[PDB]
């Protein structure tokens, strides 16, 4: 069974009279999802699996695009010297289930076994119609909404020894995380249950140690451009960019408030080039969501000191799709 | 942490002769994750093998890389004069601390002269007390100040030139630096010298007010 | 092909900052990490950190973490390196290099897709001087033996030029007459911030006597020249 590529069409469950953008694209976009979706495990047979190199991973960054750019549509746009503008009506915008699904004439295997680390081979596969449903959920540092681990948590890693490889980290417990716009208009915050938080650093410490018996640093981002030098989402429609130091500030041998911007002006993640939208919209703006995961980098430096600091990270978006994804793989049939 | 220890720090070899450079990760690494490099004096280094043993643009099959695990060497089948460099190796962000490929030549004892301070100098209440050494072979030399038999530390420079390109020697000085107080106090200036080239440590002095 | 262009030499003041700039061209930028390597002089090349070019993320070596600034301009794909608070000790040679390219035009590749520490495309470098310093001529002494320590037919003068900044300067003996058995050496930059070297020339102790001889030392950044006559002191 060789690994192959195609055009894996979606599966959602959107609603005809929402006027909310997700609902509207999966409505021409995808098909209704399956009841009683059917799982077969294969007997005696071990698959060789790559979250790096997942074409998978690939098609979803070009749906997700496409997705933005028909519904989150901006005043002005500079793409290289060429300045588009068009009209920009405030939308309803959040993320709803994605599943995908094989065509005819192919598949999707599955690795079942909990302990697999994304790169290498599982011997335990199994065979899905579809995905299970992920809410493609564009942020940075923290990964929202999405998938757990089952008993302990995960660091994934290309080669953790390589400083430049992206760290994702996937949680076995949610922590809450609530930003709110209360009724400045561009000040917003928000808030993070500290002991919840404490016991998360904790857990990723543990098995981070695993790779590096040394003291465990967490810090800051020290570079970037905004959008990942913050968690950067978005809620009600309006981009956040939120302040990160109080989650990644702590030495290892209540409630957390995060100050947060709403900005008009942005870095498109699509593409290279700026965007601008309207002014924000007045009333309250209010996000409940679960981090799930995390985005990491290691500090590098060629010295034997008694420390490894890490400090979040991300950007390419692909990264996220991949902490869902990891264990999926399409493969062409006889 | 991946720190590398290249050995020898020198390495002389004769044109048309073998060479065989050495690399030891602090721990088991990858072959693929080890590359050599070559530095001449002015340049940036330059990527010779990007593999263990997968040679790079214009780099003749006579560099020839090797080794697993602990263990990495790069072996040139016949050294020619355009060889000749400082060679690096690496293993992601660290790199050693250098070979030095040396075109090698007969042993040479250095000829020693000390020079005592000008009185121009002593003017301006400054005193420079120099040391030559000239034309040795090998580059190890030990430059010992000591100062009415009182071994100095701390108040002097050494500066050693190329490898010549005719003779293929080195020649250094070494210079103490005193304040004129301290160098009108004392007598006896002594330059002491450690080579391969003597049969014994070589001692040039003088004494402060003579011809 | 790729070019990586760096700017030119620059002389700064302790406590200053300076910025360095690596201007590239030959491929996409935004498809491979930029990273900054520092090379003291006679010691091992060292790296500083990388960057994406790519929402502009970076990863600081641990020691230089307060030190260094990586940053970069998009559209004239060129690279900057700012270090603060110099130092003596920040005294050296400074390096843009990239690794090899693994996409030439794959859909969405980026920079940390690639292998990063393959360094086949390095800058020429920029040297950077931190001293408190300011251009100044040379002190020239001449360095004559004692005349109670000689041997046979083989004696040693020069002259010690001391003092001066910044580099460099030219010294020849007799105008550039007497070039056999000529050594001057490499200049060092002492605590004072300011270079000093010796050139010296072995003669024969029988022309000591009859033959004058003079360093002819040339500084041009002070426009300063200096003819010293050396002989032995009676
Ligand atoms: C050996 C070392 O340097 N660090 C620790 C060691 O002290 C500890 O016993 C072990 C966990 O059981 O993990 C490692
Ligand atoms: C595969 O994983 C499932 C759930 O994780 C488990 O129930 C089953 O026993 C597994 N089979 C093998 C052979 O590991
Ligand atoms: C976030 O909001 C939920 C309500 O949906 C609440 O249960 C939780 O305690 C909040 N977490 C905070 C404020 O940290
Ligand atoms: C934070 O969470 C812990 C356990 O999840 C809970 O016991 C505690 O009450 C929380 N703090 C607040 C202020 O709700
Ligand atoms: C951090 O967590 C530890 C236990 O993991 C807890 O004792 C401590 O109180 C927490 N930090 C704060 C500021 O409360
Ligand atoms: C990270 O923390 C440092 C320490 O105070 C602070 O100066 C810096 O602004 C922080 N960075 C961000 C992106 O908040
Ligand atoms: C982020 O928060 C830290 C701590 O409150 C603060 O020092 C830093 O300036 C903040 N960053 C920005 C960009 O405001
Ligand atoms: C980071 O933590 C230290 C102690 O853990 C604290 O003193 C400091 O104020 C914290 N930084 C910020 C920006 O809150
Ligand atoms: C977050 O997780 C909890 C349980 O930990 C669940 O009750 C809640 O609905 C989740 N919220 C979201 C937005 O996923
Ligand atoms: C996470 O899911 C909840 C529930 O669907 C939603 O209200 C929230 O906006 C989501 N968060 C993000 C960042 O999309
Ligand atoms: C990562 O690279 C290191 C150094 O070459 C090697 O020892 C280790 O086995 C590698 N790990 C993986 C998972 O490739």
Same mark, same amino acid.
């Given at each position: 069974?060789?690994?192959?590529?195609?055009?894996?069409?979606?599966?959602?469950?959107?609603?005809?009279? %929402? !006027?909310?953008?997700?609902? &509207?694209?999966?409505?021409?976009?995808?098909?209704?999802?399956?009841?009683?979706?059917?799982?077969?495990?294969?007997?005696?047979?071990?698959?060789?699996?790559?979250?790096?190199?997942?074409?998978?991973?690939?098609?979803?960054?070009?749906?997700?695009?496409?997705?933005?750019?028909?519904?989150?549509?901006?005043?002005?746009?500079?793409?290289?010297?060429?300045?588009?503008?068009?009209?920009?009506?405030?939308?309803?915008?959040?993320?709803?289930?994605?599943?995908?699904?094989?065509?005819?004439?192919?598949?999707?295997?599955?690795?079942?076994?909990?302990?697999?680390?994304?790169?290498?081979?599982?011997?335990?596969?199994?065979?899905?119609?579809?995905?299970?449903?992920?809410?493609? @959920?564009?942020?940075?540092?923290?990964?929202?909404?999405?998938?757990?681990?089952?008993?302990?948590?995960?660091?994934? /890693?290309?080669?953790?020894?390589?400083?430049?490889?992206?760290?994702?980290?996937?949680?076995?417990?949610?922590?809450?995380?609530?930003?709110?716009?209360?009724?400045?208009?561009?000040?917003?915050?928000?808030?993070?249950?500290?002991?919840?938080?404490?016991? *998360?650093?904790?857990?990723?410490?543990?098995?981070?140690?695993?790779?590096?018996?040394?003291?465990?640093?967490?810090?800051?981002?020290?570079?970037?451009?905004?959008?990942?030098?913050?968690?950067? #989402?978005?809620?009600?429609?309006?981009?956040?960019?939120?302040?990160?130091?109080?989650?990644?500030?702590?030495?290892?041998?209540?409630?957390?408030?995060?100050?947060?911007?709403?900005?008009?002006?942005?870095?498109?993640?699509?593409?290279?080039?700026?965007?601008?939208?309207?002014?924000?919209?007045?009333?309250?703006?209010?996000?409940?969501?679960?981090?799930?995961?995390?985005?990491?980098?290691?500090?590098?430096?060629?010295?034997?000191?008694?420390?490894?600091?890490?400090?979040?990270?991300?950007?390419?978006?692909?990264?996220?799709?991949?902490?869902?994804?990891?264990? +999926?793989?399409?493969?062409?049939?006889? | 942490?991946?720190?590398?220890?290249?050995?020898?720090?020198?390495?002389?070899?004769?044109?048309?002769?073998?060479?065989?450079?050495?690399?030891?990760?602090?721990?088991?690494?990858?072959?693929?994750?080890?590359?050599?490099?070559?530095?001449?004096?002015?340049?940036?280094?330059?990527?010779?093998?990007?593999?263990?043993?997968?040679?790079?643009?214009?780099?003749?099959?006579?560099?020839?890389?090797?080794?697993?695990?602990?263990? +990495?060497?790069?072996?040139?089948?016949?050294?020619?004069?355009?060889?000749?460099?400082?060679?690096?190796?690496? /293993?992601?962000?660290?790199?050693?601390?250098?070979?030095?490929?040396?075109?090698?030549?007969?042993?040479?004892?250095?000829?020693?002269?000390?020079?005592?301070?000008?009185? %121009?100098?002593?003017?301006?209440? *400054?005193?420079?007390?120099?040391?030559?050494?000239?034309?040795?072979?090998?580059? %190890?030399?030990?430059?010992?100040?000591?100062?009415?038999?009182?071994?100095?530390?701390?108040?002097?420079?050494?500066?050693?030139?190329?490898?010549?390109?005719?003779?293929?020697?080195?020649?250094?000085?070494?210079?103490?630096?005193?304040?004129?107080?301290?160098?009108?106090?004392?007598?006896?200036?002594?330059?002491?010298?450690?080579?391969?080239?003597?049969?014994?440590?070589?001692?040039?002095?003088?004494?402060?007010?003579?011809? | 092909?790729?070019?990586?262009?760096?700017?030119? !030499?620059?002389?700064?003041?302790?406590?200053?900052?300076?910025?360095?700039?690596?201007?590239?061209?030959? +491929?996409?930028?935004?498809?491979?990490?930029?990273?900054?390597?520092?090379?003291?002089?006679?010691?091992?090349?060292?790296?500083?950190?990388?960057?994406?070019?790519?929402?502009?993320?970076?990863?600081?070596?641990?020691?230089?973490?307060?030190?260094? !600034?990586?940053?970069?301009?998009?559209?004239?794909?060129?690279?900057?390196?700012?270090?603060?608070?110099? !130092?003596?000790?920040?005294?050296?040679?400074?390096?843009?290099?990239?690794?090899?390219?693994?996409?030439?035009?794959?859909? +969405? /590749?980026?920079?940390?897709?690639?292998?990063?520490?393959?360094?086949?495309?390095?800058?020429?470098?920029?040297?950077?001087? @931190?001293?408190?310093?300011?251009?100044?001529?040379?002190?020239? #002494?001449?360095?004559?033996?004692?005349?109670?320590?000689?041997?046979?037919?083989?004696?040693?003068?020069? /002259?010690? &030029?001391?003092?001066?900044?910044?580099?460099?300067?030219? @010294?020849?003996?007799?105008?550039?007459?007497?070039?056999?058995?000529?050594?001057?050496?490499?200049? @060092?930059?002492?605590?004072?911030?300011?270079?000093?070297?010796?050139?010296?020339?072995?003669?024969?102790?029988?022309?000591?006597?009859?033959?004058?001889?003079?360093?002819?030392?040339?500084?041009?950044?002070?426009?300063?020249?200096?003819?010293?006559?050396?002989?032995?002191?009676?």
């Amino acid at each position: 069974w060789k690994e192959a590529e195609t055009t894996l069409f979606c599966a959602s469950d959107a609603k005809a009279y %929402e !006027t909310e953008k997700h609902n &509207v694209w999966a409505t021409h976009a995808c098909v209704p999802t399956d009841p009683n979706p059917q799982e077969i495990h294969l007997e005696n047979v071990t698959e060789e699996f790559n979250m790096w190199k997942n074409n998978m991973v690939e098609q979803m960054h070009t749906d997700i695009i496409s997705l933005w750019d028909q519904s989150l549509k901006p005043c002005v746009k500079l793409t290289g010297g060429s300045a588009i503008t068009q009209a920009c009506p405030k939308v309803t915008f959040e993320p709803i289930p994605i599943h995908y699904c094989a065509p005819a004439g192919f598949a999707i295997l599955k690795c079942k076994d909990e302990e697999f680390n994304g790169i290498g081979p599982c011997k335990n596969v199994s065979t899905v119609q579809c995905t299970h449903g992920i809410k493609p @959920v564009v942020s940075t540092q923290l990964l929202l909404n999405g998938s757990l681990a089952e008993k302990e948590v995960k660091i994934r /890693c290309e080669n953790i020894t390589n400083n430049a490889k992206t760290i994702i980290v996937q949680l076995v417990n949610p922590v809450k995380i609530n930003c709110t716009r209360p009724n400045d208009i561009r000040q917003a915050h928000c808030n993070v249950n500290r002991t919840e938080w404490n016991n *998360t650093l904790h857990q990723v410490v543990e098995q981070l140690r695993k790779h590096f018996n040394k003291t465990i640093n967490f810090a800051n981002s020290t570079g970037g451009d905004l959008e990942i030098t913050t968690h950067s #989402f978005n809620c009600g429609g309006e981009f956040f960019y939120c302040n990160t130091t109080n989650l990644f500030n702590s030495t290892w041998n209540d409630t957390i408030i995060l100050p947060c911007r709403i900005k008009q002006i942005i870095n498109m993640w699509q593409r290279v080039g700026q965007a601008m939208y309207a002014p924000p919209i007045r009333g309250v703006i209010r996000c409940e969501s679960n981090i799930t995961g995390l985005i990491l980098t290691r500090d590098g430096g060629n010295t034997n000191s008694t420390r490894e600091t890490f400090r979040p990270g991300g950007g390419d978006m692909r990264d996220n799709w991949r902490s869902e994804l990891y264990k +999926y793989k399409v493969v062409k049939i006889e | 942490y991946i720190g590398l220890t290249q050995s020898p720090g020198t390495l002389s070899v004769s044109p048309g002769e073998r060479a065989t450079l050495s690399c030891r990760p602090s721990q088991a690494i990858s072959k693929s994750h080890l590359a050599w490099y070559s530095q001449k004096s002015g340049q940036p280094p330059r990527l010779l093998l990007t593999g263990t043993y997968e040679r790079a643009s214009g780099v003749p099959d006579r560099f020839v890389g090797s080794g697993s695990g602990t263990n +990495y060497t790069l072996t040139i089948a016949s050294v020619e004069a355009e060889d000749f460099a400082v060679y690096f190796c690496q /293993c992601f962000e660290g790199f050693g601390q250098g070979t030095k490929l040396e075109i090698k030549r007969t042993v040479a004892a250095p000829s020693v002269f000390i020079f005592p301070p000008s009185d %121009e100098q002593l003017k301006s209440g *400054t005193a420079s007390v120099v040391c030559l050494l000239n034309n040795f072979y090998p580059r %190890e030399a030990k430059v010992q100040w000591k100062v009415d038999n009182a071994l100095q530390s701390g108040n002097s420079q050494e500066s050693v030139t190329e490898q010549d390109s005719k003779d293929s020697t080195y020649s250094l000085s070494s210079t103490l630096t005193l304040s004129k107080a301290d160098y009108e106090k004392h007598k006896v200036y002594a330059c002491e010298v450690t080579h391969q080239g003597l049969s014994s440590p070589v001692t040039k002095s003088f004494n402060r007010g003579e011809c | 092909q790729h070019s990586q262009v760096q700017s030119g !030499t620059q002389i700064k003041t302790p406590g200053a900052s300076v910025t360095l700039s690596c201007g590239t061209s030959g +491929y996409d930028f935004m498809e491979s990490l930029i990273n900054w390597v520092r090379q003291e002089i006679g010691k091992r090349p060292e790296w500083l950190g990388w960057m994406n070019p790519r929402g502009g993320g970076v990863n600081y070596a641990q020691r230089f973490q307060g030190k260094v !600034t990586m940053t970069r301009d998009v559209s004239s794909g060129t690279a900057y390196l700012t270090l603060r608070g110099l !130092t003596s000790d920040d005294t050296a040679k400074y390096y843009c290099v990239r690794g090899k390219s693994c996409c030439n035009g794959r859909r +969405y /590749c980026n920079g940390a897709d690639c292998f990063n520490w393959d360094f086949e495309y390095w800058g020429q470098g920029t040297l950077v001087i @931190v001293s408190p310093a300011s251009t100044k001529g040379p002190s020239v #002494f001449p360095l004559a033996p004692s005349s109670k320590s000689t041997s046979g037919g083989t004696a040693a003068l020069g /002259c010690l &030029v001391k003092d001066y900044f910044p580099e460099p300067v030219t @010294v020849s003996w007799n105008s550039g007459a007497l070039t056999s058995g000529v050594h001057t050496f490499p200049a @060092v930059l002492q605590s004072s911030g300011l270079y000093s070297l010796s050139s010296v020339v072995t003669v024969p102790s029988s022309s000591l006597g009859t033959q004058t001889y003079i360093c002819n030392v040339n500084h041009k950044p002070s426009n300063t020249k200096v003819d010293k006559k050396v002989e032995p002191k009676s």
